[PDB]
């Protein structure tokens, strides 16, 4: 199935597309291993979006997250500044 | 600690009742609470014991060891007051029972009910349509044997009988009252007795069958004489085999654990422990064991 | 100096009544300060109350104190106070530590090898030195002699905080109550996941103290702790739990060999203590960090152990 | 309250009487004051056999008292109550180590006369000490014990089915908590081992008058050698064996528990004294 994994990077879009495909390039090579490519629309791999800059130094400081009986690691970012981009396919 | 409750009546008693009363002062009483006043509604083991129904023993045995126990001080009119029993304290307790069993041997009494007739102990109030029994009083070789004797008739009643109904003490031969049936907890508890011994009936050893086996032919003793030279083949059947050591302290250990499940099985009721006994006052300073 | 002087002139016994029978006039004061003190003794007043403060030294006891030493890794200091406590037998002459189980630690022993689950071990989540921590255990719960080598010594008072070499402080017999000068009282905190209370189960003579039973037993799955609540006396309540074992004598009528032992003995009880019957058992709440279980809270707790009565 | 009991000494002690006193002083000692029957000695004296059950029935009966402080007149010694508690101490010949058990029996001294005793030589009696001992020691000799004297007899009468040496190499010792105790075994114990045989080889028809007065359920958990038995038999002997078999089976049930059992909190193994309430 599909995953939402999160990046933070201090790189251009031009960048983290190329940086992205290096990085999936394992993943690249397992779809097209566990499932073969017969129809033209699965040939496709992902796609990112930029939601937002912050400052590169104080970002991310950790913190954790509370429900009722259970806690779960959490990322925490300061000051933002939220600027959507639109859908850029990775492959 | 003032344990002192008032069990008020309901209405006036008469002159005979005061007597009666009065004839029985410091007679083991079970209370049903523990609380400051209670009342004569409620006192007593005839809300266990009623003329209605089937006399049944056992049941009122686990209300005895269940509830609170107290001995009768004062009978005044439209009053009456009883002291609680609790453990650490010493009370005086006068062998006033119509089936008169002396406690010469000073051992630990026991609590029972009035197996031996409701009639002796039926204590009467016309004041209210109260019927309060009296618990009887006997020390434990007694109680083992009405025990017993409670928990064979139940046994025997389908297959002389007059030795199993009446009780053999050393002084004196008083006839106890033997229900038909005995009930759902004296059945119950007959029921438990049943499938321990059919459980641990293949638990036994197999050495003391030669013991009894060389003991009857060799040396009669006086405890040999229930079998009256007497051997079955179950005992021949179950010693056709050698025997070991490991085995038998392994049954042994869990033979051990399962007599004491049966002591405590057969430890029904109260056990007081008594302590210098009084033979001319006919009374007993006694703590709850 | 007179503040403890001012306090210990408060915490002192009364001197005695005299009765001078020799002389005649003093005997006329003795009995008006008789008289007296009853009156003021008796009457609705607050010098009736004052009076049930000097005690008169069988009616109180000082309690005895059970004082082991524990590591403190086999320890959870969250914990609330009137923990039952569970000693095991130590084999070794002169070892001085022992292996107690709080029933979160004793939850995770059970269970390692087969919420309580979450809280247990959510403040024990090393199963390794606990499970360590006793020499054998699949062994003594398939000879079914773990029940004699565990020993309840009450509900924990006071813990004195530790790096290492933590200590404990336990009633085992007698009346709980803390250890502290200052005085409080100990709620005996026992959870609910493992408690019952057996006339819920049930569904009538009002008793002086209803006690409390614990049962571990030897279930298929493994060990079982039951943390029973009864009305009613030892020679009873094994019967009691003799009806309330019914699936446990179709087990045992399952077994057909009779020579493997283990398999007919069902567990042991034992009776822990006895407290108020009439101001019965609250349910409460012991927190931790990240969740909290109910918790069955018992109070005036007068604790004497009882031994293993096998059923 | 006072509790303070005193024996009536009429004899003065001599100075080893004193020794051996202050010797066992933290023990337990029963009652019947007298000085006479004071203690169980009167049990383990030269008047009546040393029977087992005769024993453990008065000490059953008989109060107990510890003691404190000996002098050469007089016998100073706290009776037991359940009320409060006392400091006891395991000074028995046969030692046995309470390292934490919280519980403790009181047996009769099946491990010889000597081994408990206190011999007053210009007194007139010879005073013994019961068994104080933890309660998996004391079945633990008891089952072996009374194993030795049901196989010591099985071998008087024909030893070509058992050993004496065989029996005596797992039943002369006990171990319990790392301690090895060794069992000083040789008449004695003969009422007891005599009860438990004539009552175990009573209850197969006990058994079957049971599963017979209320069906194949539980006739099926007796094995096949132990179930096969003629059903011929009158009313009178029958019903005797059956009174007999439940009045000694009480007897046995009620030996096997071990008397006012006693409970200790914490054993000082450097004082040799526990605090110990009556339970």
């Not at chain 2, 005995?182 to 007959?190: E, F, K, M, V, W």
């Not at chain 2, 040396?219 to 070991?244: G, K, T, W």
């Amino acid at each position: 199935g599909p995953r939402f994994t999160f990046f933070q990077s201090s790189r251009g879009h031009c960048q983290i597309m190329n940086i992205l495909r290096i990085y999936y390039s394992p993943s690249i090579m397992h779809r097209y291993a566990v499932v073969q490519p017969l129809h033209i629309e699965e040939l496709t791999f992902g796609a990112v979006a930029c939601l937002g800059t912050f400052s590169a130094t104080d970002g991310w400081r950790r913190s954790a997250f509370n429900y009722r009986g259970s806690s779960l690691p959490v990322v925490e970012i300061d000051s933002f500044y939220s600027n959507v981009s639109d859908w850029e396919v990775i492959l | 600690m003032d344990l002192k409750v008032v069990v008020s009546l309901s209405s006036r008693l008469y002159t005979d009742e005061i007597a009666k009363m009065q004839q029985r002062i410091g007679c083991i009483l079970p209370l049903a609470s523990t609380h400051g006043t209670q009342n004569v509604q409620g006192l007593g083991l005839g809300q266990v014991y009623s003329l209605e129904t089937v006399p049944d023993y056992v049941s009122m045995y686990n209300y005895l060891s269940d509830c609170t126990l107290a001995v009768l001080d004062e009978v005044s009119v439209d009053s009456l007051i009883l002291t609680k029993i609790v453990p650490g304290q010493t009370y005086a307790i006068k062998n006033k029972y119509q089936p008169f069993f002396q406690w010469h041997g000073t051992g630990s009494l026991s609590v029972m009910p009035p197996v031996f007739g409701r009639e002796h102990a039926t204590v009467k109030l016309e004041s209210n349509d109260v019927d309060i029994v009296f618990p009887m009083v006997l020390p434990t070789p007694i109680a083992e044997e009405v025990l017993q004797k409670i928990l064979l008739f139940n046994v025997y009643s389908r297959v002389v009988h007059m030795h199993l109904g009446s009780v053999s003490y050393l002084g004196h031969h008083y006839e106890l009252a033997l229900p038909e049936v005995p009930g759902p907890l004296g059945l119950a508890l007959l029921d438990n007795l049943s499938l321990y011994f059919c459980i641990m009936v293949t638990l036994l050893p197999r050495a003391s069958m030669r013991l009894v086996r060389g003991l009857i032919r060799h040396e009669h003793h006086d405890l040999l004489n229930l079998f009256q030279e007497m051997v079955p083949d179950e005992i021949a059947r179950i010693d056709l085999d050698d025997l070991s050591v490991a085995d038998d302290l392994s049954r042994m250990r869990v033979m051990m654990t399962y007599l004491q499940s049966l002591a405590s099985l057969f430890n029904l009721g109260p056990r007081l422990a008594t302590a210098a006994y009084s033979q001319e006052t006919l009374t007993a300073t006694c703590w709850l064991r | 100096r007179r503040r403890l002087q001012r306090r210990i002139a408060g915490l002192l016994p009364p001197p005695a009544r005299r009765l001078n029978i020799s002389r005649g006039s003093e005997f006329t004061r003795d009995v008006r300060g008789l008289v007296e003190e009853h009156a003021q003794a008796s009457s609705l007043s607050a010098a009736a109350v004052w009076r049930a403060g000097l005690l008169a030294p069988s009616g109180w006891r000082p309690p005895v104190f059970g004082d082991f030493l524990i590591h403190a890794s086999s320890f959870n200091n969250a914990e609330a106070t009137g923990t039952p406590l569970f000693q095991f037998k130590q084999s070794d002459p002169f070892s001085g530590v022992d292996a107690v189980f709080t029933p979160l630690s004793l939850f995770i022993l059970m269970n390692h090898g087969r919420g309580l689950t979450r809280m247990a071990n959510l403040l024990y989540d090393s199963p390794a030195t606990l499970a360590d921590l006793v020499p054998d255990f699949g062994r003594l719960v398939a000879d079914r002699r773990f029940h004699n080598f565990i020993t309840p010594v009450g509900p924990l008072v006071e813990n004195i905080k530790s790096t290492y070499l933590n200590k404990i402080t336990t009633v085992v017999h007698g009346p709980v109550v803390s250890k502290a000068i200052p005085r409080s009282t100990v709620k005996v905190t026992v959870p609910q996941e493992a408690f019952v209370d057996l006339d819920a189960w049930l569904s009538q003579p009002c008793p002086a103290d209803a006690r409390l039973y614990v049962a571990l037993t030897y279930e298929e799955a493994g060990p079982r702790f039951t943390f029973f609540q009864s009305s009613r006396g030892h020679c009873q309540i094994m019967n009691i739990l003799r009806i309330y074992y019914s699936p446990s004598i179709m087990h045992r009528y399952a077994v057909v060999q009779p020579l493997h032992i283990e398999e007919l003995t069902f567990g042991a009880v034992a009776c822990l203590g006895t407290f108020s019957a009439t101001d019965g058992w609250r349910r409460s709440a012991f927190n931790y960090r990240g969740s909290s279980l109910p918790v069955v809270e018992i109070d005036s707790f007068y604790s004497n152990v009882s031994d293993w009565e096998v059923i």
